Design a protein around this ligand. Sequence first.
Ligand code: SF4
Lengths: 197, 180, 450, 300, 433
Amino acid sequence: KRPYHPHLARSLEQLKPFFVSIMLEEQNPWEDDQHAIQTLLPALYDKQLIDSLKKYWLDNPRRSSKEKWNDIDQIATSLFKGPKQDSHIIKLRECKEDLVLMTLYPKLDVEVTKQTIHLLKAPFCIHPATGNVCVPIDESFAPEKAPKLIDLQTEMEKNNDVSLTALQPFINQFQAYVSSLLKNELGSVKREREDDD
Amino acid sequence: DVERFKDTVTLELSCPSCDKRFPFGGIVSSNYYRVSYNGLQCKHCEQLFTPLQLTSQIEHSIRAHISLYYAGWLQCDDSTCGIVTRQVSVFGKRCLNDGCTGVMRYKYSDKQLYNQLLYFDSLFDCEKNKKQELKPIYLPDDLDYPKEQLTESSIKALTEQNRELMETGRSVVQKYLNDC
Amino acid sequence: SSSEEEKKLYARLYESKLSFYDLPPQGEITLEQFEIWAIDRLKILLEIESCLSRNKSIKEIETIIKPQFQKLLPFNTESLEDRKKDYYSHFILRLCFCRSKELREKFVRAETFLFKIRFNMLTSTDQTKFVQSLQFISNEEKAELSHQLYQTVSASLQFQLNLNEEHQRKQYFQQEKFIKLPFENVIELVGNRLVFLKDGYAYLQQLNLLSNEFASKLNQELIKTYQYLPRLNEDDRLLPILNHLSSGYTDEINAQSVWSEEISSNYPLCIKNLMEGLKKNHHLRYYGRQQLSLFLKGIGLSADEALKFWSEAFTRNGNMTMEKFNKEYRYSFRHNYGLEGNRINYKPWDCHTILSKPRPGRGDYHGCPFRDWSHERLSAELRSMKLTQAQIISVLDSCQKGEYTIACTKVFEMTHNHIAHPNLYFERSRQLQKKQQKLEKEKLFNNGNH
Amino acid sequence: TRAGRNEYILLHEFSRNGFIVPDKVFEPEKGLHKNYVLVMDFNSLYPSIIQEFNICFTTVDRNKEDIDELPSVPPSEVDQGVLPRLLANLVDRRREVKKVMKTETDPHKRVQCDIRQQALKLTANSMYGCLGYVNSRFYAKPLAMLVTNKGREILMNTRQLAESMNLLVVYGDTDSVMIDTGCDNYADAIKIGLGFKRLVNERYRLLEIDIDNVFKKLLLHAKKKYAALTVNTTVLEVKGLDMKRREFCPLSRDVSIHVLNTILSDKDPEEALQEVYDYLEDIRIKVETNNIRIDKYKIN
Amino acid sequence: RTMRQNLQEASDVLDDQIESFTKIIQNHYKLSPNDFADPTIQSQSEIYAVGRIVPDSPTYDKFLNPESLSLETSRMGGVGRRVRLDLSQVNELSFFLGQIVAFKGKNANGDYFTVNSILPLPYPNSPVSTSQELQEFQANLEGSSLKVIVTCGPYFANDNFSLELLQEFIDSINNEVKPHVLIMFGPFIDITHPLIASGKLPNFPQFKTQPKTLDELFLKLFTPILKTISPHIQTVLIPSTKDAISNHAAYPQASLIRKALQLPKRNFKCMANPSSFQINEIYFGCSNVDTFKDLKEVIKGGTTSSRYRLDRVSEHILQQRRYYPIFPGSIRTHISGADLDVSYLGLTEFVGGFSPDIMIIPSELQHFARVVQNVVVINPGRFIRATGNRGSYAQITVQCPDLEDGKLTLVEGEEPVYLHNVWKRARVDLIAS
Ligand code: SF4
């Protein structure tokens, strides 16, 4: 829907600097011509532009994602001429922004949030297939940083104390979060008491 | 309005000069009275009614009805008892006949008296006079059904000519209609 | 209270042309005023309900209701009497509809829609005065958040107020005021991304939230009025009017032509049922005879033709002699026409009085088919009227809700292209038939000159 | 009166549990109802309300300074009070008595069990007088108002349920509700009444209402002012319409009784009415010709 | 208040009459409520009972007798049941319909209540005043006596509209009598006046513009004439239910609107019917329904029959603590009547339970002024007779209060108050108009 809601526009601005660096180079999913036809072309609005890009990429196979991204604009400029060119340019920009959101915006699991009675896995639980601890996440977190239970056992064999294992930083982070939550809960109780008087 | 006044009684005037009595049905055809361009006129002796001679009778009829209403007659619902009385038991709705299960009701209910006062008011409603929605004071089989029927244009012009008299007569009734 | 003090209080209350009906009216009104104002507001609400059940657009409903406003409940007038009429009518209808949950829901829905329409017909300055009369944000806070607020509200402006030009939208936004409230109260607007959110507060579409608060307050006040009603039950004077208002929500014509197809296409289904019963059995019981006789009188059948009609219908099977008909039935048929007894001209039965009937048993043909017939049988005749399955389903859905008059209007509309009276149905059908005949005659005349 | 039994049982129970005891409507639809009309007994409304909502002296927090203030029913966490516990005990003992009755063969013991069940029912239905009666030793205005409001709610939802079954409430109060079944056969009317009973019990688990009277016909004017043809074998029964028989001669009473018999007979309402007219005209001819015994003209 | 009559509310008032009189009797005779029982049911112990006098049959002959009366019991006393009276054992009594009575009796066989003795309702307490107020009144009068004139309608005869006698009376009071206060009862323009009734109202040559309504007839016929009353004479206007100028035709009757009559504020006061008010210390009780003509007694005994009727009627009015105790209301057959609004019979009771010092109940009967139970009862008669001959009016002259002369009686108590003795101090003259 246009115009974007301020949340949608803000998310688009936050995601725009990362779109190139992730999709067009690091992942490069549209280098494959079939993958391009399957995922990049359907996000465009004009059938003539889609057909022209399809023919161009068939004649020039295996253009990388950045090259195809520039080809979209080049062929659209070549096709859409006259007083109506501005509307076509705006629509192409809108489609490109829609693809940026489609590719980078959060894709939540909608069931778990809807109802108060829904159950969700507790933190620090062990994933049965990988053995990773469901540790809390900071800004530097990566999946390879999650401690494994067998590694924690190996550490505990040398040092029979949880405080000397790789699980400890996450425990400290969770403890700090809990302390802040309790402080805010006390503040909210005080505010409610003040409001009632 | 047709069903509202089906049970009310007619407004009876007495001629100041010749003493002839006749119902007053508004500005309508009648053998006994004529509303002329210059006021109400009795047809028996051609003499004119002046506001006071009309409004005094209107007020007298209204106050007679109010006195009768305050007389406090009660009637029994039960069709096999049907007594009419002014005694009121400390249980109001109870019938005073031994063992009677009928519901006593004021014979002259305030609904009936409000309808009567509204009929009186409609008699001197000029707009109601023009469109001719007043309740008839004669049945077709009545010996006094009028021989001549007034026309619509005559009614309009005559009501316009007599606006002041009709408004004063209406104010006489409204004196009690605002109090009811 | 002195008349002057009463006027002062009423003016303090109407500082705006629109109200939440927060404080009870004070003063005395006559019974005629009570009933007339109640019936007028009830007619307005019933027309609102009929428009809504037909899925009419808001603009169409407004256009239909404006003349009804000018006639029954004048709004945007400076007269104290019209404002008194609105306030007292609203509180009388509160007394009427507080009895049952379904009545409460219908009343609050209709009243909220009426509120919406009235707010829409107000001027922007009057709307601002009413909303000022729920904390508004300061001009500084509006300036800081101006870009986000304009982005949020531009689409709403374009689609609701038809401000297609961007300059007009910006000019309106500069004058528009915003209300800061928690998003939990406007979650409905949050879902469609119509309101701007910041730090748990929603910045306001104001009409929707105002209507929601009005509906909630009205529901609560109806509940309180229902709790306090038994104390009012001691007033013998108001109870019949309240009961009636609550239930109110629920020689061309002669003895021979009334049987003809030309006249037979126009009756409502109740009348067709009564006539079919009369033809089959050559007899109708008391309530059916009364309903049919009053309808026939209301459609133009004179007394003599009514006597001929009834005698011919009753003596057709030979089971009734003319002597018995004159001994037992002639008096009643003449009485229905006001020729006997107190000469009371009985009015034909509307839908409500028919429904107040005591339910038809075996051998009875009176009442309303949409209430008294089984779903299969109704589907049978509605198929016989060449109605599609979807139309039949809609009519049966209306019947299931207890909106029998709505289904009557529906079958009228599908068979011909709000009715609450059999004579009204007959009259509308007759007018449409005459219009169609005139159009056909004009077409024939036009096709004869080429 | 009932006052002695109510107050006495209450004080006994309270003294036994370590408690200190205190010191000493829907307007009738008048007219003839052709369809079967059932009288449905609602006597157990108040005891079932007290039991279901745990209303008691010890459970309902009430403002004892202002007795007119309406209190709220206790939350489900509150343990069962003494009053609802006694009501439940009475109901359970009645159920035990009926279970024993179903198996019992000896007529003597069966009659004894029936008397026991009737006494238990009477006490359970009279228990409300403890807290409703104004001059009761255990009077409590807030509790009486609470129970009365709940009864009003239950009666209105009973109307709504009856309308959901396409039934018409002819008349109703806290004690009885009369429903128009819309049928003209005994089996159909009883089935409709049992279905309505099942629905009411489904919506109110502790409310068990039952059919008290079966009216094939009903000319109704008030709760206790009506005539009907009751089924037990149909029989004519009149209530409140035989007040003044002395003022009327035996001929008038015979005419009235015959007219009632004919109108309420199982004949079509037109042939029966023509029979009434034939009877009336024949009576007029015999009166005008004086061919009736002079005894029928006597008035005492 | 509008013109509404509710059977339940009227029945509530009629019940409250019996209950209040029961409590008054129990207080006066120091009797416990257990001593009072239901007289409509058989009991073989003698019981106390309070109720209302009613005919034993609801459709009764115009004339009653001592063998055709019943007692109507209150809702609590006897569930509203009515019991026949057996008065063979009572030799002296006087009853009327609507009187509230107290009986000591016995209902033995179920169908008759035998009265063994009567329990006369006590006479209400008289008003009292402090020393300071009496000295202020002494200063007010400047030594001289208090003069108050009372007149009653009709004011003009049946065959004309002349108020020449009224003008003569006004000149007399202005220049010779010079009273302090003048009380005028209605009717002013009686609506039962046959010329008003029949519409025979002629043109008036002395009016520039003819009246169009009876209200304008009053404004043009009476108000000029009343305006000539000296401003030093405060005058009181009390309506009757037959007054055409009133839009409240029910007793109790709301006071006239002085502005509507165009009467100046300086000395014109409009009071309700009935009304109770003080002039200096003197308590006035004024009612404009002819209780004296209407109250028809049933009587046994030579002693009571040998008494004057007027004293008996005045004692009945005092005992019933209400100016019009008859019920049902009297009727004039329909032409006019009492026009009782039963729902508001509370307003016609003695204000505060005090018995007025002078009670004025105008009657069509001959003028009279009498002292009954230390209360002066005045009937000044009609100002003008039907034929136009001189009627009558009453002059009340009361000696100025004096604590030292002894005619005021001191009431014992910590706070000293003094009983007005008007019957000792008032002279009442009935003067031909
Ligand atoms: S809705 Fe009314 S007009 Fe239509 S069939 Fe039913 S009763 Fe007749």
